[PDB]
């Protein structure tokens, strides 16, 4: 039974990585929101 | 954008009312056109995206005067 | 030549093949090749704009010289080659100056044939001349819309146009659709008919044949649900509706030409 999550570091970084968020303004707002909440992990860091 | 380079006219949102007074959002667009104006001061043609009202404004005033105002506005033509 | 293959197995019973013995059995001319990446019917937005496109064999692009601007240079037909991008075969032609080029092959070409372009050219098939110098009533192909554009009419296998009249600076042509169009006399055209006239006799035989030609299955509107197509819905094959396109436009006899710009060049319409 193949499950939904099939890990891949390259796909994870290129999809939800820090640079991916900064590319668009919506991603920048995502980072801004999580800085405000004080989350330790801003994004998925390798 | 659909902005006249002389009068600054830009699209403005509004309503359109039917017989039953139903209101739906619409948008009014300026009558923009691309026109080439001959300028004797610089001896060449300048292309401006101007509305019909703006073209009347250019005729009433001078093309040189309008260009000076555009330059003072700070936007390249 | 048309060959009917024996029904050794289902999928071969209805296959009719077209075999051209004089086609080149080898790789094409590399300098005139270019990559042709498939699209699958998607546009720059990534959405499907044309349906039933996708898959198929990889095929490279041959730079076919439609303009034919080499005026005054005699050329010799080296060989004929199969072009995957076209219904008609192409011909590799070597000019007297050492330049090779690809051109559409009319019905009459064969290896070693002589062709010439420009106004100072003969009347044999394969020569390109301005339509002013082409005698009225002759058959031409690869006709130009505008001087130097390149050539857009009668490009498929076994296609041609008729020159019917010449008034002033404009010429009237009868297209394969039965429509009469008025074209400038300065436009060039190629004498003769496009070759491979038997290309229409193939039948492909089975479903896979159309599949690896780049065509995907077509689903009828009735088979779909109401939310997907204007047709569809109901139990037991109910239609009860006028035929329409998937986007609501009424098909099956509704004229969709709305140009008002090129109408001045149209003399008669299709009948």
């Amino acid at each position: 039974m193949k499950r939904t999550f099939q890990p891949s570091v390259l796909k994870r970084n290129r999809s939800h990585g820090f640079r991916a968020r900064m590319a668009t303004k919506n991603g920048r707002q995502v980072l801004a929101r999580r800085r405000a909440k004080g989350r330790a992990r801003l994004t998925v860091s390798k | 954008s659909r902005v006249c380079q002389v009068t600054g006219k830009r699209p403005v949102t509004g309503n359109n009312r039917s017989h039953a007074l139903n209101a739906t959002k619409r948008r009014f667009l300026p009558n923009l056109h691309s026109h080439r104006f001959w300028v004797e001061s610089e001896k060449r043609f300048v292309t401006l995206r101007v509305s019909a009202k703006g073209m009347r404004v250019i005729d009433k005033k001078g093309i040189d005067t309008v260009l000076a105002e555009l330059r003072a506005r700070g936007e390249k033509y | 030549a048309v060959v009917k293959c024996k029904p050794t197995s289902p999928g071969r019973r209805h296959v009719v093949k077209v075999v051209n013995p004089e086609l080149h059995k080898g790789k094409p001319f590399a300098p005139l090749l270019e990559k042709n990446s498939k699209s699958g019917g998607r546009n720059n937005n990534g959405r499907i704009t044309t349906r039933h496109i996708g898959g198929g064999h990889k095929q490279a692009y041959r730079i076919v010289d439609f303009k034919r601007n080499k005026d005054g240079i005699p050329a010799v037909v080296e060989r004929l080659e199969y072009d995957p991008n076209r219904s008609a075969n192409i011909a590799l032609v070597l000019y007297k100056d050492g330049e090779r080029r690809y051109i559409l092959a009319p019905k009459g070409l064969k290896a070693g044939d002589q062709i010439q372009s420009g106004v100072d050219a003969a009347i044999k098939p394969g020569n390109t001349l301005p339509m002013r110098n082409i005698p009225v009533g002759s058959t031409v192909h690869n006709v130009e819309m505008k001087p130097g554009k390149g050539g857009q009419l009668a490009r498929s296998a076994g296609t041609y146009v008729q020159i019917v009249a010449r008034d002033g600076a404009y010429v009237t042509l009868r297209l394969r659709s039965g429509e009469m169009r008025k074209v400038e006399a300065d436009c060039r055209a190629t004498l003769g008919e496009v070759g491979n006239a038997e290309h229409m006799l193939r039948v492909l035989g089975k479903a896979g044949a159309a599949r690896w030609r780049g065509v995907r299955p077509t689903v009828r509107g009735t088979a779909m649900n109401p939310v997907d197509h204007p047709h569809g819905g109901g139990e037991g094959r109910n239609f009860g509706k006028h035929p329409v396109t998937p986007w609501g436009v009424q098909t099956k006899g509704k004229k969709t030409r709305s140009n008002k710009r090129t109408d001045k060049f149209i003399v008669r319409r299709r009948s």
């Binding site: - | 001959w38 073209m55 009347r56 005729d59 009433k60 001078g62 | 106004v119 100072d120 301005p130 002013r132 110098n133 600076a169 300065d186």
Partner: protein, 149 residues
């Protein structure tokens, strides 16, 4: 639109008369070509001051020079040898490029836009008449005899 006219307009030209004209006509033809200047309560005093007669002679000499130029070649004949086809079907149509260049090299030095062709583009081989307009009121006739080579 009330504008002052400088050049002779064939229909309504009267050397600076306050005559109405379509905005497009003045905007696209007169003003860009210098045939008129928009005057609105400011240039009327100026036109009657320095444009009233000072430029009248300046405008006239241009017509006088044009009249002199079109009589430079008294022969008024143009002969060009072209490798025409067999029994007609001239090699290729020729407009104003070649004929103007040949005339300029040996004949009247004239601009490209001056030459007008009323009989097509010289398709048939033989004698043809070409109307030359060096001025609005000055028309010239030139006979051209293309000879096959």
């Amino acid at each position: 639109m009330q504008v002052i006219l400088l050049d002779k307009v064939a229909n309504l030209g009267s050397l600076g008369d306050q005559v109405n004209v379509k905005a497009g006509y003045a905007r696209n033809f007169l003003v860009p070509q210098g045939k008129a200047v928009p005057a609105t309560k400011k240039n009327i005093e100026f036109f009657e001051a320095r444009r009233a007669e000072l430029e009248a002679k300046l405008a006239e000499v241009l017509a006088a020079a044009n009249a002199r130029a079109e009589k430079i070649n008294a022969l008024e004949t143009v002969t060009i040898a072209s490798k025409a086809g067999d029994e007609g079907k001239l090699f290729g149509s020729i407009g104003t490029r070649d004929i103007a260049d040949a005339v300029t090299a040996a004949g009247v030095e004239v601009a490209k836009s001056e030459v007008r062709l009323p009989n097509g583009v010289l398709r048939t081989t033989g004698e043809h008449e070409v109307s030359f307009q060096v001025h609005s009121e000055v028309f010239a006739k030139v006979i051209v005899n293309v000879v096959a080579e």
